[PDB]
Amino acid sequence: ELPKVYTENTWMEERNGDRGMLKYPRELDITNVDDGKSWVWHSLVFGLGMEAPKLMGTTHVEIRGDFKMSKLTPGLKYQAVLLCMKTDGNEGWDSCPLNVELNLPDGTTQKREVDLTKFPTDEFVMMVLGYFEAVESGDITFSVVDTSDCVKKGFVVKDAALRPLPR
Amino acid sequence: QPELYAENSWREEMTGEKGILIYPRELEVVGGDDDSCWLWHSLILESQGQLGVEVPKLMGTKHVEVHGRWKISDLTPGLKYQVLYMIMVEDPLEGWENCPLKLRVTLPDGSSQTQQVDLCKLPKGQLIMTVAGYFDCVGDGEVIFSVIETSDVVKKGLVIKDAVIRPLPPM
Ligand SMILES: O=C(/C=C/c1ccc(O)cc1)CC/C=C/c1ccc(O)cc1
């Protein structure tokens, strides 16, 4: 077994000190992820693996997460994203868009419907949760939800990230 | 747990552009197989477990040279792309005083641009986004992106997390 390097889920731009952060699937709140049927934890292997859940079949899809503003850079414009993948053999997404919300400390909420049949198959997509400018304190929360009658299948959650606008 | 193999990439949702991540095991690390130069570690985030990344830590060598490459034709045409190296520095750190890490992007036309990063000023342990350069996605051939320091001094304490090739999309 290899020696270890420990990390934290933030990063900093060398050139100016701007911060971003991300959270991995065990740091998210996924309803019924341990029910043994709706989600199956996989080893996500690129090119060792990371623990990532794949949706195997349920009508109840509910993914939530949260972040602290204090860890971000005040005044800086951010994009909030969920890295996720529609896999081959997906089902249920024709009739059921995912409902996506980003909640900011100022009480606002950005809402959108996401039609997953337009995502490419078997590659990760940066699903847009929303956009905001960071302040000094407060909680950021997001949700990706559908509980409709369609049995949804074939969806991997990789991580959630708050990144300064790419430049 | 069942294994899931995936391309180490992403697509922007609204606009379609493709970004690339390259883990260090897929880069060309000169002296990468010599433990007295680079010792390979498992990357841990406590609240999640292992992140599934093997990362090299510089252990005491004068020759720092790491290369990545990617076919420009595999990226999204007409976009401007930005190459990043994600790195970390850790105690013990040694040798870097006045020998900044060189980041280079070389194009198919042989043209190249180099930035410099003073590792001595970085906060230890923090994951650092460094900018290696930019390029427009046109033509084909391979873009080469490197970190280099070959000054005559033993260096230690640099950790390479991954390289990133990311589009700058409209929003
Ligand atoms: O444009 C960016 C994309 C971030 C990103 C985060 C998680 C992914 O799944 C895919 C991409 C932000 C700047 C780079 C952040 C980053 C953090 C850790 C890392 O290992 C590589 C890049």
Side-chain angles (χ1 to χ4, degrees), chain A residues 3 12 19 27 43 45 112, chain B residues 2 4 13 42 44 47 126 129:
Chain A
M12 182 181 86
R19 284 181 99 73
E27 308 175 274
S43 178
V45 178
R112 51 182 304 242
Chain B
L4 173 43
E13 178 196 353
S42 167
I44 306 282
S47 55
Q126 302 207 23
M129 207 214 63

Side-chain angles (χ1 to χ4, degrees), chain A residues 11 22 83 126 158-159 161 163, chain B residues 10 21 84 86 127 129 161-162 164 166:
Chain A
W11 75 86
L22 70 167
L83 277 300
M126 239 183 219
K158 186 199 179 185
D159 59 65
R163 68 171 173 171
Chain B
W10 80 89
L21 313 190
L84 316 164
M86 314 289 315
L127 187 71
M129 207 214 63
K161 164 65 186 303
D162 47 49
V164 178
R166 67 167 181 178

Side-chain angles (χ1 to χ4, degrees), chain B residues 10 18-20 22 70 75 81-82 135 145 163-167:
Chain B
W10 80 89
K18 185 194 199 173
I20 309 295
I22 300 129
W70 206 262
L75 304 176
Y81 273 85
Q82 177 189 43
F135 67 94
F145 39 99
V164 178
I165 305 175
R166 67 167 181 178

